[PDB]
């Protein structure tokens, strides 16, 4: 069932995303691209001190309602 998470973005603003626990990290980056315009391959996501891996789900990290993620940019290439 759906939930909101919070994402702190590189420009300094916190945005929200509508997600599902079964959503993949790739799915989440796609949503972030829609909102922030950052290409998924230039996105790095962290939950606490965990870097989130493509192929994994939000539930795999026990990311929950109103959990907060940090979004940073990766150098292209």
């Amino acid at each position: 069932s759906g939930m909101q998470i919070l994402v702190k973005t590189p420009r300094g603003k916190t945005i929200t995303l509508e997600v599902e626990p079964s959503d993949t990290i790739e799915n989440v980056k796609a949503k972030i691209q829609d909102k922030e315009g950052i290409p998924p391959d230039q996105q790095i996501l962290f939950f606490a001190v965990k870097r989130l891996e493509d192929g994994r789900t939000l539930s795999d990290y026990n990311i929950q309602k109103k959990s907060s993620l940090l979004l940073a940019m990766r150098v292209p290439g």
């Binding site: 300094g12 962290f46 940090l70 940073a72 940019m73 150098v75």
Partner: protein, 61 residues
């Protein structure tokens, strides 16, 4: 030198909060404990930048 610019502790050891304490690099070629720079980035209310050189932050790798 051989110390994390944020916590001023050696790269080959843990950050003050630490255990796996990996190192990361900015495009500006400054190195930090991952935990240190994450703590800094999280606190920033403006565009993410290096604590040392104030260049725009991007993780190299």
């Amino acid at each position: 030198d051989e110390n994390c610019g944020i916590c001023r502790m050696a790269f080959n050891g843990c950050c003050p909060d630490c255990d796996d304490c990996p190192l990361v690099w900015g495009q500006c070629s400054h190195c930090f404990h991952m935990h240190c720079i994450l703590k800094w980035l999280h606190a920033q209310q403006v565009q993410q930048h290096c604590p040392m050189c104030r260049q725009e932050w991007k993780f190299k790798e």
